[PDB]
Symmetry: D3
Subunit: 129 residues, 6 copies
């Protein structure tokens, strides 16, 4: 109940575009990455000691084909969808600002490009292999 776990082999996702002023993002060890990608992220509090993670939230992504492991996580599109929704809500508030508008546009165009990968794999017939 210390709201606190051993950092273990979890890797801290540290990226120049993120300030880590309040939160830190961890994922699992690269050695445990399945299918070329990380799938088990933790958002913890940044002022936590480095040997531990103070967990705020866990986010797990679909890992393996739904065909044999079933539905077991979220998709990138789900998270992007939540952000667009929230930002759009702020646009409908006194916090409306141009930076949010650009961010919404970028996120929509992001969804468009990911969708294009999918639609192309349709026209090629190999969807979800």
């Amino acid at each position: 109940s210390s709201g606190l776990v051993p950092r273990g082999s979890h890797m801290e996702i540290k990226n120049g575009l993120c300030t880590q002023k309040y939160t830190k993002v961890y994922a699992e060890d690269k050695e445990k990455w399945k299918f070329n990608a990380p799938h088990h992220f933790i958002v913890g509090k940044a002022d936590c000691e480095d040997e531990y993670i103070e967990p705020i939230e866990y986010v797990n992504f679909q890992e393996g084909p739904i065909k044999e492991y079933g539905i077991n996580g979220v998709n990138n599109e789900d998270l992007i969808l939540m952000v667009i929704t929230r930002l759009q809500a702020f646009q409908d508030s006194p916090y409306k600002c141009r930076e949010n508008a650009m961010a919404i546009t970028k996120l929509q165009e992001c969804l468009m490009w990911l969708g294009k990968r999918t639609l192309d794999r349709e026209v090629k017939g190999i969807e979800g292999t």
Copy 2:
């Protein structure tokens, strides 16, 4: 059971998003606090509309941190997860131009939100409820 009562939860629907296996839900718009939804659920789509089959719960920071403390994730955290995974894909056999475009979009989204944050730092109002 795997199902929970849908209740006031509203399904979030975008045409840009497919919906085959997953569904996204937020708390009811009348129940939003601080002008946005903060309590999302991804559930299984093949569920009756009366219910939600929750896969994942995501709760966002409610209220400025400097006034209410850390109690949820930020947009930036989720976007960083998606970036990290797309970059991982690019460093794989499935590197592709669409993923590169999507990374560029997500990074530029982070830069626009970060311009907002920097401006609010300069004005000293970052993490508050000032406008």
Copy 3:
């Protein structure tokens, strides 16, 4: 050979080099469904009173449901151009400018298709609603 200009207007764009060819559409008073639909690419060195057609391009006027398939869509023309520029990128003449142009054109299709997908949440696609 030539035809009379008449009520046809010349479509000038400052972004368009307009060296050897000129573009025309029907008079703006003659537009149906709020847009021009009958375009003529003609030769530039021709009379003011004359258009020397090279090609006619006819867009779908009104809903197919009522007026039948009777013209092309914007998406079709843009598909043509994307195909050609992608062909150039398989050539000695691959250049970054063509790559940018392809990216812009694909993103244009994406925004038009977001409009379509939204109208297909409402089942009003191809209609005048």
Copy 4:
């Protein structure tokens, strides 16, 4: 009302709905100067064996000053799509997707023109490099 499809190839693009029309081009073995120049928009409701032409679009093939003006340019079609989208914006059909698309198509024209202006700075306009 029909022509045989023959060697014409069907342009399938995932960003293109192909709900009511298909776009066809000439065989790749017949592409001249690295690119297709002879496109057909036909009705999607036809057997593969046949094409039901709605419209013919022919692109200038060969240098203009050696073969004369025999077809349209990419910029011509893009100009028409921009013109019609701006008409839509100046109508009840105005929407943000159209504004986005108009922006993208203008930036397309800007990049293609850059290619031109650069080649003129190098003094190499209209040559094989």
Copy 5:
């Protein structure tokens, strides 16, 4: 001493996207802006007292329409060209990176949008004039 000049009527151009680590940007006061924009910019050392400016560089922009007032300063396009040229040089070097590539693309598209404006104004015969 010999370097320092009084800040006086100079405004400091603070932008959250600029780091201000080694330099600061100043311009003439908004009250003195001619033709709706600042034209007299000073890059100075940041590690100065706010009372003074330590000029590193003066940049003076074309002030008043050229047709009317003649050439007396640089244009936005000139400085953007300078920056593009340097960034392209960095791309053609051991220090090639994707961020510079994006910045070059953005600056080029900036030149293209300003140029669409200039094109459109040529066609109207109003380029270089004060006409709207």
Copy 6:
């Protein structure tokens, strides 16, 4: 008020019309650390044999503690142009072309800054 062009290179760019002004840098042979640092804006109506200086612009050349702060940064000039274009946007000359330009310049600043921030996470910048 002219000067000899000398070894100075003229920056000839398809995106630049040279209608009123020409931009010049130093000879490629004199480039330090892979880039030009000493630019001149001169009047374009000048024979190739002279430069008609309107303005000199010198960029930070060499490491800062070895040679001092001896010039401007790319970010500074972009900040000037953004400030001017925003002023124009608050004027009778407001237009969509300016707004697009501003957006591009802000995104340019974001990308250059990202390189800086990435380097700082990895422990070296400046």
